[PDB]
Amino acid sequence: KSVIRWCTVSSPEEKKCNNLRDLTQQERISLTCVQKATYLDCIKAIANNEADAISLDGGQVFEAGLAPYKLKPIAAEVYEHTEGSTTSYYAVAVVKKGTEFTVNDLQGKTSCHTGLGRSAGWNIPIGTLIHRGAIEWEGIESGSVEQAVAKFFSASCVPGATIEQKLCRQCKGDPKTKCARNAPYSGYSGAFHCLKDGKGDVAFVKHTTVNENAPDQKDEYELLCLDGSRQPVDNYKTCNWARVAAHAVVARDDNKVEDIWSFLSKAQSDFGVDTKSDFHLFGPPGKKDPVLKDLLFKDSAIMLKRVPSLMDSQLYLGFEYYSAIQSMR
Numbered sequence: 001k002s003v004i005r006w007c008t009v010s011s012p013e014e015k016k017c018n019n020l021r022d023l024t025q026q027e028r029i030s031l032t033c034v035q036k037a038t039y040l041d042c043i044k045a046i047a048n049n050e051a052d053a054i055s056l057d058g059g060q061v062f063e064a065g066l067a068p069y070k071l072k073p074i075a076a077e078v079y080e081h082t083e084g085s086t087t088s089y090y091a092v093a094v095v096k097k098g099t100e101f102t103v104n105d106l107q108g109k110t111s112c113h114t115g116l117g118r119s120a121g122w123n124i125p126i127g128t129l130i131h132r133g134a135i136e137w138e139g140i141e142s143g144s145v146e147q148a149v150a151k152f153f154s155a156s157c158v159p160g161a162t163i164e165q166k167l168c169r170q171c172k173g174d175p176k177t178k179c180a181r182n183a184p185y186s187g188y189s190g191a192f193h194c195l196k197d198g199k200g201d202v203a204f205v206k207h208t209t210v211n212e213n214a215p216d217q218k219d220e221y222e223l224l225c226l227d228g229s230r231q232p233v234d235n236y237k238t239c240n241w242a243r244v245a246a247h248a249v250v251a252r253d254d255n256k257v258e259d260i261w262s263f264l265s266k267a268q269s270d271f272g273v274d275t276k277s278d279f280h281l282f283g284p285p286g287k288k289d290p291v292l293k294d295l296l297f298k299d300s301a302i303m304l305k306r307v308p309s310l311m312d313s314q315l316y317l318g319f320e321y322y323s324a325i326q327s328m329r
């Protein structure tokens with residue numbers, strides 16, 4: 001059919017899509033918006049030929065490429081801060097300059113994480129240490145990864161932990177709320193202030209966190225590299241634990257792919273970052289309300305680039321990211 005069914009997951013998203021539909025109705029390939037409840041119902045619908053495309057972040061792209069769905073990324077967002085590359089950010093392990101331990105000596109240290117279940121603060125560092133054999137965890141009937149992590153760090157602040165009391169021990173706040181998901185130490189900046197205040201030896205955050213929170217104090221900090229070195233905060237490209245890819249549009253591997261990309265390439269041409277139209281494919285940025293943010297594509301995206309036909313989800317996400325999330329399941 002020369003109809004692309006975009007899958008949407010909220011009513012403001014569903015609205016943006018019907019506006020792009022009105023705006024492209026007289027093009028030969030047309031748009032039609034399907035709304036489902038969650039992104040997972042959208043993966044099942046694309047898989048079952050009920051819809052054809054949706055933009056997913058990296059963990060959701062992992063999910064969409066596994067059996068039985070087997071969707072692959074076909075185009076990916078580009079952002080200003082990562083300069084032509086299909087990368088959202090790099091996960092790094094920030095330490096104070098002058099401590100001497102390397103990644104070989106992490107056992108028994110205290111740590112700061114953004115929260116339980118988050119990419120840079122929990123899924124990438126802990127799946128990397130499990131994959132490399134530093135943390136032993138064989139699977140959920142063992143129990144939670146919280147127990148395995150508690151035999152590795154001596155105490156931590158992990159916002160959102162519920163199984164192990166040591167995982168909340170380094171957290172700031174009164175007893176009732178120090179380990180809540182919205183604690184004083186949650187998020188990228190929270191896990192950095194945990195490191196700054198000496199409550200942990202390592203903060204698992206992203207490559208921009210020190211520059212955002214402490215621009216004027218970068219050289220008090222270093223990065224812990226997976227090869228044994230410690231490098232400057234600005235050396236994240238050669239000293240990160242994993243690259244977290246850009247959001248990608250996933251689709252069934254079948255020849256409707258050139259049609260989706262043909263639709264997207266004209267849509268971007270007319271309504272991309274430099275459009276004089278009122279409809280913007282990408283944002284613009286500055287929507288304060290979460291329900292109004294990043295509808296269809298990220299508001300910060302500046303274009304979409306076609307993913308080579310031979311990259312599947314593993315190749316798109318990269319080995320470090322992939323083998324770390326694979327270890328968390």
Ligand SMILES: O=C(O)CN(CC(=O)O)CC(=O)O
Nearest residue numbers: 114115117118119120121122
């Ligand atoms: O990525 C996530 O899963 C959630 N975040 C926030 C975000 O990325 O905006 C923190 C983290 O990565 O620890």
Ligand SMILES: [Fe+3]
Nearest residue numbers: 118119120206
């Ligand atoms: Fe994140």
